[PDB]
Design a protein around this ligand. Sequence first.
Ligand SMILES: O=S(=O)(O)N[C@@H]1[C@@H](O)[C@H](O)[C@@H](COS(=O)(=O)O)O[C@@H]1O
Ligand SMILES: O=S(=O)(O)N[C@@H]1[C@@H](O)[C@H](O)[C@@H](COS(=O)(=O)O)O[C@@H]1O
Ligand SMILES: O=S(=O)(O)N[C@@H]1[C@@H](O)[C@H](O)[C@@H](COS(=O)(=O)O)O[C@@H]1O
Ligand SMILES: O=S(=O)(O)N[C@@H]1[C@@H](O)[C@H](O)[C@@H](COS(=O)(=O)O)O[C@@H]1O
Ligand SMILES: N[C@@H](Cc1c[nH]c2ccccc12)C(=O)O
Ligand SMILES: N[C@@H](Cc1c[nH]c2ccccc12)C(=O)O
Ligand SMILES: N[C@@H](Cc1c[nH]c2ccccc12)C(=O)O
Ligand SMILES: [Ca+2]
Ligand SMILES: [Ca+2]
Ligand SMILES: [Cl-]
Ligand SMILES: [Cl-]
Ligand SMILES: [Cl-]
Ligand SMILES: [Cl-]
Ligand SMILES: [Cl-]
Ligand SMILES: [Cl-]
Ligand SMILES: [Cl-]
Ligand SMILES: [Cl-]
Ligand SMILES: [Cl-]
Ligand SMILES: [Cl-]
Ligand SMILES: [Cl-]
Ligand SMILES: [Cl-]
Ligand SMILES: [Eu+2]
Ligand SMILES: [Eu+2]
Ligand SMILES: [Eu+2]
Ligand SMILES: [Eu+2]
Ligand SMILES: [Eu+2]
Lengths: 131, 128, 127, 128
Amino acid sequence: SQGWKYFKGNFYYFSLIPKTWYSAEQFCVSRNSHLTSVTSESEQEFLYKTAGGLIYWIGLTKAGMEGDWSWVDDTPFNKVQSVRFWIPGEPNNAGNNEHCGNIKAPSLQAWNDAPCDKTFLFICKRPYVPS
Amino acid sequence: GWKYFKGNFYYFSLIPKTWYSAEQFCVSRNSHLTSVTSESEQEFLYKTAGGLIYWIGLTKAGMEGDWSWVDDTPFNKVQSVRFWIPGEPNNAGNNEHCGNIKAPSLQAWNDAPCDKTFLFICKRPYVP
Amino acid sequence: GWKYFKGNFYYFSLIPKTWYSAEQFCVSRNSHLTSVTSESEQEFLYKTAGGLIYWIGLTKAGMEGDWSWVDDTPFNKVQSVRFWIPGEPNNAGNNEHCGNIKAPSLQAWNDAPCDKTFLFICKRPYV
Amino acid sequence: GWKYFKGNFYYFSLIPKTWYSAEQFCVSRNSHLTSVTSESEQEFLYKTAGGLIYWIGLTKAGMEGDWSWVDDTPFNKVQSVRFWIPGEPNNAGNNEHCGNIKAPSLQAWNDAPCDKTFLFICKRPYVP
Ligand SMILES: O=S(=O)(O)N[C@@H]1[C@@H](O)[C@H](O)[C@@H](COS(=O)(=O)O)O[C@@H]1O
Ligand SMILES: O=S(=O)(O)N[C@@H]1[C@@H](O)[C@H](O)[C@@H](COS(=O)(=O)O)O[C@@H]1O
Ligand SMILES: O=S(=O)(O)N[C@@H]1[C@@H](O)[C@H](O)[C@@H](COS(=O)(=O)O)O[C@@H]1O
Ligand SMILES: O=S(=O)(O)N[C@@H]1[C@@H](O)[C@H](O)[C@@H](COS(=O)(=O)O)O[C@@H]1O
Ligand SMILES: N[C@@H](Cc1c[nH]c2ccccc12)C(=O)O
Ligand SMILES: N[C@@H](Cc1c[nH]c2ccccc12)C(=O)O
Ligand SMILES: N[C@@H](Cc1c[nH]c2ccccc12)C(=O)O
Ligand SMILES: [Ca+2]
Ligand SMILES: [Ca+2]
Ligand SMILES: [Cl-]
Ligand SMILES: [Cl-]
Ligand SMILES: [Cl-]
Ligand SMILES: [Cl-]
Ligand SMILES: [Cl-]
Ligand SMILES: [Cl-]
Ligand SMILES: [Cl-]
Ligand SMILES: [Cl-]
Ligand SMILES: [Cl-]
Ligand SMILES: [Cl-]
Ligand SMILES: [Cl-]
Ligand SMILES: [Cl-]
Ligand SMILES: [Eu+2]
Ligand SMILES: [Eu+2]
Ligand SMILES: [Eu+2]
Ligand SMILES: [Eu+2]
Ligand SMILES: [Eu+2]
């Protein structure tokens, strides 16, 4: 399938069809991928530049009893290094119901929490495995 | 309230949610949408369900669309094939990637769209 | 060399390995050290084991050191207690963090140091 | 004592263990054998290692035997080749399924038998 863009050892798929957060993750899984994690400034830059003006689900979701933010691809969540990537004022847990995360703003400060059952475009990430 | 059966507690919800919002509720309660690994557990769940539909931990994974359990119990196709409603899973509309308990018998499971709202069942181990 | 039982294939090794080297071998065969989640599976395993000791997928995990299955089957402590040898797990020397099938009985499991070498049993689903 | 670097704490052990016994020690301390995801982290680790060999979270997984991280960080094979000692991994004796930090250089990693005993490095994120 076309639509996979390469960046630093991973391919990224910016969807054309919007889905709920979990239905997006399931699509990514059906393509041997996961909703993308973000672990560096250059990766965040790649994502929001490619996103343009559109909102995309990423692999941010609350997990555990405490509801700490986590990555669906099981990258350990680094709160210290992730603080710089939220939109100012986010996450705000509007309605006490915003348990998933999307990229929203055209900036390094781009993440927003939103209800998992809302439909948005989404970004899958899968590693390249050279022989 | 939680119900106890063979080393696990089970939560039969009173309010419906999407499959994933249900799983997040279970996770917030240190649990998961329930797996099913024996006829006695299947029987306990459908008898307790009382003829109502409840999300369980069934969901597709992998490129193959293989079914899986969200609590990471290995899914056993041979052992589980008799737990589906006859004709299910039929992936109706090409969009039924989660599973629920529906019919009151051992042949109980149906696949349904993950974004549909149903009551749900969490499962939590008792740990002495 | 794989033996079939109720939708799973099982490999009873002829070579002994440490618990983790055994698990690695199982992984290279698209499998894991076996979990045990029913009386009939326990019976099939101890009967086939024939009185020899085999590593199974039992291992301590998490901060509390509770017993777990390496294949990620949730561990049912209540229903598993009848599968340990009487008196086990006894954490001899404070260093027995993996488990094996030892006795030919439904009370079969013993905890032993993960770095000791035993025969091992892999399990993989019929797919 | 845990050493801090870029949002994670690190424990450099004083007693050697096998790879898996090392991982179990880390797990008992709410941690894992360390992953390595940047040049700056690789530099922090080998410089702190001071020329001694430490197990890290490198281990083979899957039927293919691809390298993986035990803390479940997805393994970036493209970006990690810079971190192996030239000529490694060489799977000596076809029995080297775990990895350690060995050479004090950005090219530091060696695969070695999982049953050999080395010092080890645990890693855990700061969680408020
Ligand atoms: O500056 S605010 O306007 O307060 N920012 C809010 C978000 O914080 C909130 O999550 C959404 C809900 O909409 S949703 O479609 O994402 O669910 O609406 C605005 O974007
Ligand atoms: O005999 S069939 O017609 O195939 N049975 C179908 C199901 O297989 C299908 O999942 C649902 C969709 O509705 S939903 O309520 O489950 O979403 O409708 C019927 O019950
Ligand atoms: O009733 S006891 O005799 O004390 N039971 C102990 C076990 O609990 C102990 O794990 C082993 C150590 O040997 S090992 O081979 O398992 O390492 O020896 C005995 O069998
Ligand atoms: O250039 S080589 O000779 O191939 N380098 C080898 C390593 O690749 C090999 O892993 C070890 C085994 O020793 S061990 O202590 O790590 O087990 O010995 C040398 O360092
Ligand atoms: N408002 C709570 C809700 C919550 C707790 N645990 C969770 C686990 C998953 C999803 C949501 C939660 C929070 O942000 O933490
Ligand atoms: N329960 C173990 C200690 C422990 C805690 N977590 C662990 C994880 C793995 C191995 C051992 C542990 C003991 O007392 O001896
Ligand atoms: N020669 C293979 C052996 C192997 C495949 N899968 C594994 C999983 C675990 C340990 C070893 C393997 C390799 O090192 O890649
Ligand atoms: Ca159906
Ligand atoms: Ca013992
Ligand atoms: Cl698409
Ligand atoms: Cl009971
Ligand atoms: Cl409820
Ligand atoms: Cl039964
Ligand atoms: Cl019992
Ligand atoms: Cl019992
Ligand atoms: Cl008992
Ligand atoms: Cl130490
Ligand atoms: Cl590289
Ligand atoms: Cl590189
Ligand atoms: Cl390179
Ligand atoms: Cl190399
Ligand atoms: Eu960087
Ligand atoms: Eu928000
Ligand atoms: Eu219906
Ligand atoms: Eu040497
Ligand atoms: Eu080597």
